[PDB]
Amino acid sequence: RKHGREEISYPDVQWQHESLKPVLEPTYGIILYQEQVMQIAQVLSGYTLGGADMLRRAMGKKKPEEMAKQRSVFAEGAEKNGINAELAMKIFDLVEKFAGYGFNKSHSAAYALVSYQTLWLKAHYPAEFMAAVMTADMDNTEKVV
Amino acid sequence: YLVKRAKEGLEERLAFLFPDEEERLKRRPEYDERLETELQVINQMGFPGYFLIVMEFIQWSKDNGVPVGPGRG
């Protein structure tokens, strides 16, 4: 979807809504993150921040009763924002599927910033840094090689 | 004390991130509103001592020679 081999949807061909575009823009309409689960409940269905976090938590546990209630609140919440009910529910099914794999973006990002810093350094002054890389694995002959 | 050092810490960041003052004004409201929304939950949950310990600790180790890793949960 990044390189034009498939049409980009926000998030699915059928089950998409244009209000999800600013949330899903950076990932080409793919629901990748814990935080996207929560932004979809904010934007699509008008959740509070704290109720949004409670939905993502309930998606981790995957319990029977749990969902059943939120499933209803999320239906009439979308209805109240004029977004189609069947679309809202069928998107909820996709959110729930991808929530199982969903990684913590904020945790990934804090660390990814440090990767970018080591990347920039290596590109702009990549001798000292390499020396440091060697020091990190100094005792290992195999790694040094 | 927390509210103060956070609003004023945000003022440093804002001038570093958006050193054009015209843009800082137009981009600013979102941050102030987010700041106070978070500030409300932190204070009403009753953790201000905790946040103070940690912020001081983090700052001191930057001033002196302790690089801190990305991790923060």
Swiss-Prot record, chain B:
Disulfide bridge map: none
Subcellular location: Cytoplasm
Domain of life: Bacteria
Quaternary context: The DNA polymerase III holoenzyme complex contains at least 10 different subunits organized into 3 functionally essential subassemblies: the Pol III core, the beta sliding clamp processivity factor and the clamp-loading complex. The Pol III core (subunits alpha, epsilon and theta) contains the polymerase and the 3'-5' exonuclease proofreading activities. The polymerase is tethered to the template via the dimeric beta sliding clamp processivity factor.
Family: Belongs to the DNA polymerase type-C family. DnaE subfamily.
The protein's role, per its UniProt record: DNA polymerase III is a complex, multichain enzyme responsible for most of the replicative synthesis in bacteria. This DNA polymerase also exhibits 3' to 5' exonuclease activity. The alpha chain is the DNA polymerase catalytic subunit. It is tethered to replicating DNA by the beta sliding clamp (dnaN), which confers extremely high processivity to the catalytic subunit, copying a 5.4 kb genome in 11 seconds, a speed of at least 500 nucleotides/second at 30 degrees Celsius.
Name by which UniProt lists this protein: DNA polymerase III subunit alpha
Organism: Escherichia coli (strain K12)
